[PDB]
Structure 1
Amino acid sequence: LDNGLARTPTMGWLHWERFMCNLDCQEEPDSCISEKLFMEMAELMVSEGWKDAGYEYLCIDDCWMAPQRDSEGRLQADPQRFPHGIRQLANYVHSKGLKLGIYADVGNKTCAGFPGSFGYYDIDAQTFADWGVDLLKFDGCYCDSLENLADGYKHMSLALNRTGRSIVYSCEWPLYMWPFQKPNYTEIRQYCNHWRNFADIDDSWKSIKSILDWTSFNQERIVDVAGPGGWNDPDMLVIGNFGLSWNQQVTQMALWAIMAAPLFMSNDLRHISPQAKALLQDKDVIAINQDPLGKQGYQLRQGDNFEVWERPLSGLAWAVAMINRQEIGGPRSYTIAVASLGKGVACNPACFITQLLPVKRKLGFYEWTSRLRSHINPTGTVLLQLENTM
């Protein structure tokens, strides 16, 4: 989408994975989907260094709406859970130097059963712009035809443009097309700043593996369309929650950097460990994810329960990730000729290699003839940056 936005992958916080559709504000006031929850996350994004690291978009997912539209046919936030309304929340978020994302659905209802946007695309876009919304996640539930799906996503894209406000447009179009016909990613990229490809993430290593394996399987089709203005979205970061070991969290951070994925945390910023916070705020890894060149990495090799991924970066540098997919035993040794990396150019005549994950360590100079040897933890990843000696 050529709207001047998402020139690097969007970074921020989205409530869905950790908070879901919790409407019980009476019994769970601190975890229900409410204006107070978002104010708390905004305050912590400022005070705990998240904004400084690049996490800029504070996004509402499903279950913010009132059960029905108002007398004017416009969407409204829930009167009890969002008493001051979305425009007022957007004012607060902006006063912290942050941006607000909101959620809507192309069909007749949202996935949770709240008002859909079919029939109201222009009214809904103008409402969002009037509210000061900075990003829209547009879901695909309750949509009876592929044609309505396509028409709705394109129509909403254009209506957002017509409002005159800069609004990141996050689509789920491919995900809902895929079971029925193969998406045309050139078209989707014309209309979307990033697009969900695969099933929802959850708090599990199984989910991470299946997202990586799907991206791996379809990379011929999706890698080259990604670039400034339009990204593949493998769904939220779940670092900081409950289901991933430290090494599985490292694998997610490293591979979301390799994949030039949007970095949407879905966690509880009020209760997050120092390790998880340091990983999500890792400056070198975010710099890889945010590389201005914007070329999505890809899987180079797969075999012996090992995976090698690499990503070309700005100025003749490369990122390389090595995954140990064996879920038994100990740190397993992997060696690869450095001449096989970076299309044979990364380390010709030589390169300086810095390991970034799981710990930062300079490895030294590698000649074009060298072999790189590493020990990779089960379900973990070693992330390296290669700088050509020039």
Structure 2
Amino acid sequence: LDNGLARTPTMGWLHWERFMCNLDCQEEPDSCISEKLFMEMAELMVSEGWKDAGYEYLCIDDCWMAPQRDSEGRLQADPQRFPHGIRQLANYVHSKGLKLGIYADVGNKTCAGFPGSFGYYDIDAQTFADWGVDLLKFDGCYCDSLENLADGYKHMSLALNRTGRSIVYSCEWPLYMWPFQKPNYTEIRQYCNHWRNFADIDDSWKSIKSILDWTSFNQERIVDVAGPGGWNDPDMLVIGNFGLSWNQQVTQMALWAIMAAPLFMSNDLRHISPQAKALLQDKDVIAINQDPLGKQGYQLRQGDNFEVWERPLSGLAWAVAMINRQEIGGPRSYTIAVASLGKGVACNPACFITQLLPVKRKLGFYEWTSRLRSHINPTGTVLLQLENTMQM
């Protein structure tokens, strides 16, 4: 989408995976979807260094709406859980230096059953803009036809444009096309800043594996589509929650960097380990994800329960990720000729190699003919950065 936005993948926080559609503020007040949750989350985004690291968008997902539109046919926030309204929330979020994301649905209802946007595309776009919304995630439930789906996504893109407000447009269009026909990603890219391709992540290594395997299986179809202004969205970061081991968290962070994924954390910033916070705030890995060239990486090799992925970076640099998919035993040795990496460009005539994950350590100069040897933990990833050089 050519709106000047998302020139690097968008970074922020989105409530869905960790908080879902919890409406019971009486018995579960700390996890119900409420304006207080987002206000406190904004405070922590500032005070715990998230904003500084690049996480700028504080995003509301489904279940913020009142059950029905107001007298003027406009959407309203739930009166009990959002009594002060979205415009006041956005004012608060902006006063913290952050940006506010909201959610809506292309069809007659949101996936959780709340008012849908079909018939109100321009009204809803203008409403969000008046409120100060800076990002829209547009879901695909309750759409009567493929034609409705595509028309609605295009219409909402145009209607947001007409407001004159800069609004990141996050689409689930390709995901909801798969029951019927395969997506045309040139069109989607025309209308969307990023798009969900695959099933929702949950708090499990099984889910990470499913997402990565779908992505690498489909990579000839999606990798080259991505670039500044339009990204593939493999769904939220779930680091900091409950179901991933440390090595599985490292794998998610590394591979979302490789994939030029939007980085939307879905966790509870009020209750997050120092290890998870340091990984999510890792400056060198975020710099890979945010590389200005904006070319998505890919799976280079797979075999013997190993994977090698790589991503071309600005200035003849490359990121390389090695995944050990064997889920038994200990760290496994993996060796590769550096000439096989980065299309034989990364280390011609030499490269300086820095390991970034699981721990940061300089590995040194590797000439074009040399071999790189690593050990990778089960379900873990070694992430390396290669800097092309003439020196040594």
1:310-360 per-residue CA deviation (whole Å, 9 max, x = no partner) reads 000011100000000000000000001100000011001110000000000
- SS of equivalent to 1:278: helix
- How far off its partner does 1:76 sit? 0.1
Q: Counterparts of 2:123 and 2:179 in 1: how far apart (Å)?
A: 30
1:89-120 per-residue CA deviation (whole Å, 9 max, x = no partner) reads 00000000000000000000000000000111
- SS of equivalent to 1:36: helix
Q: Counterparts of 1:196 and 1:328 in 2: how far apart (Å)?
A: 32
Q: Counterparts of 1:224 and 1:140 in 2: how far apart (Å)?
A: 24
1:351-388 per-residue CA deviation (whole Å, 9 max, x = no partner) reads 00000000000001101111111000000000000001
1:156-193 per-residue CA deviation (whole Å, 9 max, x = no partner) reads 00000000000000000000001211100000000000
- How far off its partner does 1:2 sit? 0.4
What is residue 274 of structure 1 aligned with on the other side?
274
Q: Counterparts of 2:302 and 2:34 in 1: how far apart (Å)?
A: 44
Q: Counterparts of 1:338 and 1:84 in 2: how far apart (Å)?
A: 58
What is residue 45 of structure 2 aligned with on the other side?
45
Q: Counterparts of 1:222 and 1:62 in 2: how far apart (Å)?
A: 27
Q: Counterparts of 1:24 and 1:247 in 2: how far apart (Å)?
A: 34
- SS of equivalent to 2:154: helix
Q: Counterparts of 1:181 and 1:344 in 2: how far apart (Å)?
A: 38
Q: Counterparts of 1:90 and 1:227 in 2: how far apart (Å)?
A: 29
Structure 1 residues 10-159: aligned runs within 5 Å: 10-159=10-159
- How far off its partner does 1:274 sit? 0.1
- How far off its partner does 1:28 sit? 1.2
1:210-261 per-residue CA deviation (whole Å, 9 max, x = no partner) reads 0000000110010001000000000000000000000000000000000000
- SS of equivalent to 1:220: helix
Q: Counterparts of 2:252 and 2:239 in 1: how far apart (Å)?
A: 8
- How far off its partner does 1:144 sit? 1.2
Q: Counterparts of 2:245 and 2:222 in 1: how far apart (Å)?
A: 29
TM-score, length-scaled by structure 1 = 1.00
- SS of equivalent to 2:207: helix
1:29-71 per-residue CA deviation (whole Å, 9 max, x = no partner) reads 1110000000000000000000000000000000000000000
Q: Counterparts of 2:65 and 2:179 in 1: how far apart (Å)?
A: 29
- SS of equivalent to 2:5: coil
Structure 1 residues 328-347: aligned runs within 5 Å: 328-347=328-347
Q: Counterparts of 1:254 and 1:18 in 2: how far apart (Å)?
A: 21
- SS of equivalent to 2:3: coil
Moved over 2 A (4+): none
Q: Counterparts of 1:278 and 1:179 in 2: how far apart (Å)?
A: 39
Q: Counterparts of 1:203 and 1:30 in 2: how far apart (Å)?
A: 19
TM-score, length-scaled by structure 2 = 0.99
